Each structure stands twice: as structure tokens, then as C-alpha cells.
Amino acid sequence: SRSYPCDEKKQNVIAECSNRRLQEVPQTVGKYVTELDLSDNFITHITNESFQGLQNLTKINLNHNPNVGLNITDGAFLNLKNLRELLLEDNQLPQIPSGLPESLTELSLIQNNIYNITKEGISRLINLKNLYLAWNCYFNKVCEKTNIEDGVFETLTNLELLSLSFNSLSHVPPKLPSSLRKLFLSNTQIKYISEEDFKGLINLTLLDLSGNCPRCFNAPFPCVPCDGGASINIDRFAFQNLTQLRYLNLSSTSLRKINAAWFKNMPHLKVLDLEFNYLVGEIASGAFLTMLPRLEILDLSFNYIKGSYPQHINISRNFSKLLSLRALHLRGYVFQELREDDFQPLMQLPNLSTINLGINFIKQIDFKLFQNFSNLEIIYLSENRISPTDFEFDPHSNFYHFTRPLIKPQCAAYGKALDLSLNSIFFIGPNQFENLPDIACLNLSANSNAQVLSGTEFSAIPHVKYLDLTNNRLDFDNASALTELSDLEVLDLSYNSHYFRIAGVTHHLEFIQNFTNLKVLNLSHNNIYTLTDKYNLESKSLVELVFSGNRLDILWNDDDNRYISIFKGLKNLTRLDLSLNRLKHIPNEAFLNLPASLTELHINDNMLKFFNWTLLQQFPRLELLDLRGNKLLFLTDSLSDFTSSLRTLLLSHNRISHLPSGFLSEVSSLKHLDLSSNLLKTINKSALETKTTTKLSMLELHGNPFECTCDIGDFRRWMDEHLNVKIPRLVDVICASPGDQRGKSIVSL
């Protein structure tokens, strides 16, 4: 049938029931459901009856109930004989619930109020593979020191992952099972790591001891250093028997000195995180660098000496021993100048593909040094000074750094990438790119660049294919701009509105036609409303034009003809975005002059009161039409007369009060119709008049003010009979009248 209140669907069966304002566990769930997600509802109480007839559930998620404490009686879950993954995060739980099923393999209890880790609660769960207990007591939270009953984990003999981070521990719990692979103990106020602490865990691949004896200067959180800001104290033989270790996080442990012999017996170490320490000394001289022959990722970010600004970065020769190194991060070291000889030790590494020098206030760089490298793919120099919920930190993300790729992947994919974003390159000199290697992806966003590009500024790197010049203040006064880059495929000129705003300066966009291979052009949020000389955009190649956040309302205004064909010369164009252009009306001749090659057309978030549906006869490839967030007052009754290509029609956030007789099913093409957040109070039988298939497989109707009287029943039978038409969010397809039905789903009466 049609499931309510959850949306149920099957994979190699999952009832997503989240964020639905549910007051208690709905009882109408399907029977063959394996994975239920009740996250973000308003459930206050779980008992042994809440999931009575669903013994085929292997996964329940009750995270963030009740959002804006959750009461769970003992053994509530005890009957669920297949339950393996139980997620109870962010629930103000005061203790680990009693009587959890011996079946559990995964138990998350992140972001609760649990300070007593106890055998009664945990020792029964001998199938546990992952247990997450992070973030129950941290920062200035009002909470107790955490109590870990002795030997509480030693039963958990297939335990592979244990996370106790952001809890007050003081010391590494004794008696962990040697099954452990991943041990997270970040920000647990442990000052001292003894020889005994992990002697037994011979399978460990990840150890996280970060933020114990933190470096607190400029902490974005309440930060409590060890006494005299001292180093975490790691015993000489603490990592002796950790032969399988692959991931070592030692960020913010106030390290000044690394004991090289710590790495003696972990020659498979792949990822070493050493951010926010005091290692300027160790970076220039460290022995430990010789002990890391398989290391792929080394993170030394934010080791700057406070108030210190050395002229040069000082890199030990021993970096030349890091033969497997793939990515080196050296943000926040802070130094003025980068010279060829400062990086000799890295030049011979065969796999060094990422070098990250973000946020170092670098003033000058000798670009020729990147030339002398095996296979640099990513040169990240963003944010230097080159010149011509309810909690703040995601419990599931890295705490010390953003985890996203450095360069957008769609740019990096083209080849070698140079990111000079967020510098002070306000003008591109004639030699600013001399001695660079053959860059394919270049980022110059947010340099306050205010110049007049003219066909020569990129001569030294003519093979750029993806060029980001967003958030600058370019002065488009020359028609040869960027014409030197004849392989250019993607050009992003978003947020260069500064000069476009000014009537009196010129604005030349002619250079666009000069590329034989330009595919994607983003002119968004430029406030374009007047151009000089040539009023039209032209390209034989261009496939996608993004023109959001401009002033087509002025370009196409009734008293001016000059821009009536503005986009017509884009002969290859399939995708066009005209959103956010304050259009109240589009002149018919202007709509007719959009390229007939369009398959996708967005005019969302404007101000349209009317739309000439007849004009779609001229767009025989048009598959997606998006008119969301306008003021449209009705629809045409003749849609099938005007297109046989349209598959998706998005009409949400408009003012439609009536759906025409023979609308739904007369148009063969249409798969997906979105009428959410309109002014429909019913749907007439006659709009449901049916042909073939109807082909409609998705119809959105949430947010309309349906009159839930016996009038609607025609539509209800229709839904009942056309179960191939997915209606999402049934709990939001709600009745506005009369008062007895007000606020309920239309499906529930």
C-alpha cells in the first residue's frame, strides 16, 4: 500500500521516519522493516511495547528525541531479537539503559549525560563491535568526572572500536579487550601514557590521544592546559607492541619533543596527526622523521610560535626519508618567504602529491621550486599574503581541521592545481606566473582583483581548463580578456558585481565567443544589468550558463529591445539558470529567443505572476522546467498541447489554487510534478482524468491548505489506486479545515 507515517522502501527494507513531529513510536510501521530511523521526532518515552510487532528490526535510530529527556524503561529493547545497531545520541540520557539485547553489535550513546560506565549496562553485550560514548562531559558542561567500572570492557571480546573522547577520564582505562582496532581518547584529560596502558592491544590500527595537555592559546573552546602548559607524557615503551598501527593522532598535546623510538615498531604508520603542538624545533631537526617509511599523510598544521614570524620555513633534511609521503600539511607555521632551497628535502619524494601551505602569511614565493617535483597535483596556498545541533562541534567530524577536499574535485580532475585564493593579488603582473608548471586548475578567488584582463596575464600557464575568479572586482573593459586560455572549459566569475553595478564604467563580455571548448560559465551574483557595445552572449561550445543574481528585470525591461536576444547565440546550451533576477514578467519575444537546444531551465525565486505556457512549443528538448518561488496564480489547461518532452516541472512556492481538468495524465512525458507549498484546497476528480500511463511517478503536495471534507475523497481514492505515484512527506500533506481535521494528514480520516 502507501506507508504512513514513515516513507518505507527496500534495499537488497528501510523506514525513514525522521523529523516528522512524532509524539511516540508510531504503531503503523511495516512488518518486514529492517532499519527504522526515528531521529529528530518528539518522542518522550520508550517501553517494551513501543516496538512490539517488529522483531525483524536490525537497526533503530532514535537520535535527537525529543528535539526543538528521553525515558527508556529497562528491557524496552530486550525483545528485539535481531537488533544489531542502536543509535541513542543526543537524548539527555542519565545512565546507560539497562537490559539492552545481547544481539547489539553497534551502540552509539554520543552527546548524552552519562558519567558512570558500568557492567550492569555494558558487560552483557559480548557481541559489541563498535561502542561510541563520546561527548557526555566536556568543556564547561555541568557534569561529573567519568567513572569506568573496573574491567567493564574486558567481556567485550569482539570490541573493535571504542570512543570515549570528550569525557573526563584522567587515565586510560585498564582492561581493554585485545580485539580493539580503534581507540579514541581525545580530550579526556589524560596527562600520562604508561607502558601498561596499551601493552595488550596488538591489533590496534588507530590510536587518538589528541587534546590531552592541549595547547590552549586561542582555543575556540574552553581550554584547560596541563600544569605550566606541559607536554602530554608518553612513556618510552608505550607504543612498543602497537605493530599494526596505521593512524596516530597526537594533535594538541603540547609536544615539543618527539621520541623517535616511539615509532620503532610501527613501520606501517600511514597517518600521523601532529597539529597544534610546539614542533617548530622538531620540524627543523627531528629524528622521528627517519622512522616513518610508510607514512602517507603528515599533518603539522598550527605549530606556529606565538608572536614569531621567521623569514623562512626550516625543514629538516630528514623529510627526505618519508618515501611514501602523499600529502604534507604545514598550515599555520607562519613565515614570510618561500625559497627553492627551503624545500630540497621534499623534491625527491616520488609520491608527494599534496602540499598544503594555507594560513602562513606568506608574502613572497619562488614559484620555480614547484617545477623540481616528482608529481605534485595539488599546490594549496590559500590564505596567505601574496601580492603583485545545539552543540557547536559535530561529534562525527574531525575536531582539529575541516575534512573536505582542498580544491573542488571538478577542478582538480583536469590536472595540476594551484590555489592562490584569499591572498592579496589585486593585480596580475606580467611575471606573476613565470616558472610555474603546467597548471590545469587555478584558483584566484577572493584576491580583490580589480584589473582589466586583456589576453596576456595567463600566457605563462596557457593550458588552464578550470579557472575560478570568484569574489573579485574585475573590470571587464577589454574584449580579449582570457582569450589566451584556449583550452578553457570551466570559467567561474561569480561575485564580481562591483563594477557591473556602475552604469558609467564599461562591461565587455565579448571574449566569451572566443573559446572553442568552453563548457560551463558561471556569471552568478554579478548584478549584470548593462553591457557595452555587444549586448549578446555567444558561444558555439557552451553547454551551461549560470546567470542567477543578475538583473534581467532591467535587461528585458519593456522600453528596451537591446537585450531581447541576449542568450540566443549560445547555440549548444542545454542548461540555463535565471533564478534570482527579480523578474515579474518575461517578454514573450525574450522567452522565444532562449536557445532551442535547452534541456534544463530554471527561473526559480523571481516574481513571476504569469507564465506563457504556449511558448514551450519552441523548446522540443526541454526536460526540466523550474518555476519555484514565484507568484504564479494559475496553470494552463493545455500543457499537453505545448510539450511532449517535459519530464520535471517544479512549481513549489507559488500561488496556485486550482489544478486544471485533465492536467495530471494528459501529458505523457511528465514523471515528476512538484506543487508543494501552493494554495490548493482540493484536487478535482476531473484533473485526475487518466490516460497513459499516467507516467507520473512523483507528485509533491506538502504545504497546501487542503479542505479535508468528503470533497477530497475523490483524490484519496485516486492515491489509494495509483500507488506507483510516490507522494513524499505524507505527514506534511496537511488539512487546513475544518477545525476538527486542522493539522492532520489528509490520509488519516
Ligand X SMILES: *[C@@H]1O[C@H](CO)[C@@H](O[C@@H]2O[C@H](CO)[C@@H](O[C@@H]3O[C@H](CO)[C@@H](O)[C@H](O[C@H]4O[C@H](CO)[C@@H](O)[C@H](O)[C@@H]4O)[C@@H]3O)[C@H](O)[C@H]2NC(C)=O)[C@H](O)[C@H]1NC(C)=O
Ligand Y SMILES: *[C@@H]1O[C@H](CO)[C@@H](O[C@@H]2O[C@H](CO)[C@@H](O)[C@H](O)[C@H]2NC(C)=O)[C@H](O)[C@H]1NC(C)=O
Ligand Z SMILES: *[C@@H]1O[C@H](CO)[C@@H](O[C@@H]2O[C@H](CO)[C@@H](O[C@@H]3O[C@H](CO)[C@@H](O)[C@H](O)[C@@H]3O)[C@H](O)[C@H]2NC(C)=O)[C@H](O)[C@H]1NC(C)=O
Ligand U SMILES: *[C@@H]1O[C@H](CO)[C@@H](O)[C@H](O)[C@H]1NC(C)=O
Sites of contact with its own copies (CB under 8 A): 68, 138-141, 217-218, 220-222, 302, 331-332, 359, 383, 385, 387, 390-392, 422, 424, 426-427, 448, 450, 498, 502-506, 529-530, 532-533, 554, 557-562, 584, 609
Q: Using an 8 Å Cβ cutoff, are 570 and 547 in contact? A: no
Our CB check for ligand X shows the closer of 46 and 545 to be 545
State which of residues 470, 513, 604, 677 lies at the interface with ligand U (CB under 6 A): 513
Between CA 231 and CA 253 the distance in angstroms is: 6
Q: How far apart are CA 57 and CA 81, in angstroms?
A: 8
- The CA angle 185-186-190, to the nearest 5 degrees, is 70
Supply 506's cell numbers: 564599461
Tell which positions 209-228 bind ligand X, by CB under 6 A. Answer: 210
Spatial distance between the Cα atoms of 613 and 634, rounded to a whole number of angstroms: 11
Closest approach of Cβ 536 to ligand Z, in Å?
Answer: 21
Interaction mask 491-510, ligand Z, x per CB under 6 A:
-x-x----------------
Nearer CB in complex with ligand Z: 499/611: 499
Q: Residue 248, interface with ligand Y (CB under 6 A)?
A: no
Sign of the alpha-carbon torsion through 731, 735, 739, 741? negative
Say whether residue 208 binds ligand X (CB under 6 A). yes
By C-beta, is 70 or 523 nearer to ligand Z? 523
Q: Is 163 helix (H, G, I), strand (E, B) or coil?
A: strand
> Looking at 31-39, 112-120, 170-178, 488-496, which segment touches ligand X (CB under 6 A)?
488-496
C-alpha to C-alpha distance for 324 and 292, rounded to whole angstroms: 9
Q: Which is nearer to ligand Y, 347 or 554 (CB)?
A: 554
Rounded Cα gap, residues 437 and 446, in angstroms: 23
70 or 411: CB nearest ligand Y: 411
Position among 69, 222, 229, 350 found at the interface with ligand U (CB under 6 A): 350
Residue count (the chain): 749
Among 105, 398, 517, 565, which residue sits at the site for ligand X (rule: CB under 6 A)?
Answer: 398
377 binds, among ligand MBL, ligand Y, ligand X, none (CB under 5 to 8 A by kind): none
Q: Which stretch binds ligand X (CB under 6 A): 94-102, 105-113, 202-210, 559-567?
A: 202-210
Binding of ligand Y by 408 (CB under 6 A): yes
Look at residue 394 and give the partner it binds from ligand U, ligand X, ligand Z, none, a contact being a CB closer than 5 to 8 Å depending on partner kind. ligand X
Binding mask 468-507 for ligand Y (x = CB under 6 A): x---------------------------------------
Q: Are 744 and 734 in contact (CB under 8 A)?
A: yes
Breaks in the chain follow which residues, C to N over 2.5 Å? Answer: 12, 68, 388
If one asks whether residue 422 binds ligand Y (CB under 6 A), the answer comes out as: yes
Q: Quick check: 352 and 324 in contact, CB under 8 A? A: no
* CB environment 146-164: b (16+ within 10 A), e (fewer): bebeeebbbbbeebbbbbb
520 binding ligand Z? (CB under 6 A):
yes
Considering the rule CB under 6 A, would residue 523 count as an interface residue with ligand Z?
A: no
Query: Which partner, ligand MBL, ligand X, its own copies, none, binds residue 309 by CB below 5 to 8 Å per kind?
Result: ligand MBL
Query: What contacts 22, CB < 8 A, 6 or more positions away?
Result: 5, 38, 41, 42, 43
Which of 167, 445, 574, 652: binder of ligand Y (CB under 6 A)?
Answer: 445
Q: Compute the distance between CA of residue 588 and CA of residue 603 in angstroms, rounded to an integer.
A: 14
13 binds ligand U (CB under 6 A): no
- Span near ligand X by CB under 6 A; candidates 172-180, 396-404, 617-625, 656-664: 396-404
| Cβ contacts of 234 within 8 Å, gap of 6 or more | 192, 193, 259, 262
Q: How many CA atoms lie within 13 A of 609 on its CB side?
A: 2
Q: Does 522 bind ligand Z (CB under 6 A)?
A: yes
Cell numbers found for residue 72: 527508556
Give least dist CB 220 to ligand U, A.
Answer: 25
Region for residue 141 given its phi and psi (left: phi exceeds 0; alpha: psi -120 to 50; beta: otherwise):
beta
Our finding on whether 604 is near ligand X (CB under 6 A) is no
Among 520, 542, 635, 675, binds ligand X (CB under 6 A): 520
Q: How far apart are CA 522 and CA 411, in angstroms?
A: 14
Distance CA 15, CA 37 (A): 6
Establish if 46 lies at the interface with ligand Y (CB under 6 A).
Answer: no
Cα–Cα distance, 254 to 256 (Å, whole number)? 6
The residue sitting closest to ligand Z, measured at its beta carbon, is: 522
Beta bridge partners of 298: 272, 328
Q: How many Cβ atoms sit within 10 Å of the Cβ of residue 330?
A: 21
Least distance from its own copies to the Cβ atom of residue 376, Å: 24
Specify the residue, 10 or 655, whose C-beta has the smaller distance to ligand U: 655
Please give the Cα distance from 314 to 630 (Å, whole number): 58
Contact 167, 176 (CB under 8 A): no
Nearer to its own copies, 223 or 260 (CB): 223
Compute the chain's Rg from CA coordinates.
31
User: Could you give phi then psi for residue 492, rounded to 5 degrees?
Assistant: -115, 110
Candidate segments 38-46, 157-165, 510-518, 644-652, binder of ligand U by CB under 6 A: 510-518
Among ligand Z, its own copies, ligand U, none, partner that 140 touches (CB below 5 to 8 angstroms by kind): its own copies
Residue nearest ligand Y, Cβ-based: 421
Q: Which is nearer to ligand MBL, 208 or 475 (CB)?
A: 475
And the C-alpha cell for 417?
Answer: 592545481
User: For residues 179 and 572, which CB has a smaller minimum distance to ligand U in the complex?
Assistant: 572
The correct pick among 221, 247, 613, 718 for binding ligand X (CB under 6 A) is 247
C-alpha cell at 192: 600520562
Percent helix, strand, coil in the chain, to 5, is 10, 15, 75
Of 581, 490, 466, whose CA–CA distance to 527 is shortest? 581
- Interface residue with ligand MBL among 220, 228, 504, 739 (CB under 6 A) is 504
Part in contact with ligand Y (CB under 6 A); list of ranges 98-106, 148-156, 299-307, 403-411: 403-411
Q: DSSP strand E in 300-345: where?
A: 327-329, 337-338
Nearest to 281 by CA among 254, 233, 250, 314: 314
Mark residues 282-321: x for contact with ligand MBL by CB under 6 A, - for none. Answer: ----------------------x----x------------
* All residues at 6 or more sequence positions from 518 whose CB lies less than 8 Å from its CB, including other chains: 488, 489, 490, 491, 512, 539, 541, 542
> Which x/- pattern over 334-363 shows residues binding ligand MBL (rule: CB under 6 A)?
x------------------------x-x--
Least separation in angstroms between residue 414's CB and ligand Y is 10
Nearer to its own copies, 45 or 498 (CB): 498
Q: How far is CA 237 from CA 201, 252, 262, in A?
A: 14, 21, 7
**Which residues make up the interface to ligand MBL (CB under 6 A)?**
304, 309, 332, 334, 359, 361, 452, 475, 477, 504-506
Question: Which residues lie near ligand X (CB under 6 A)?
Answer: 165, 182, 186, 206, 208, 210, 247, 249, 271, 273, 394, 396-400, 410, 470, 490, 492, 494, 520, 522, 524, 544, 546
Could you list the residues that contact ligand U (CB under 6 A)?
323-324, 350-351, 455, 480, 483, 513-514, 517, 519, 540-541, 543, 572, 588, 592, 612, 614-615
Interface with ligand Y (CB under 6 A)? 382, 407-408, 411, 419, 421-422, 443, 445-446, 468
Residues lying near ligand Z in the complex (CB under 6 A) are found at: 410, 470, 490, 492, 494, 520, 522, 524, 544, 546
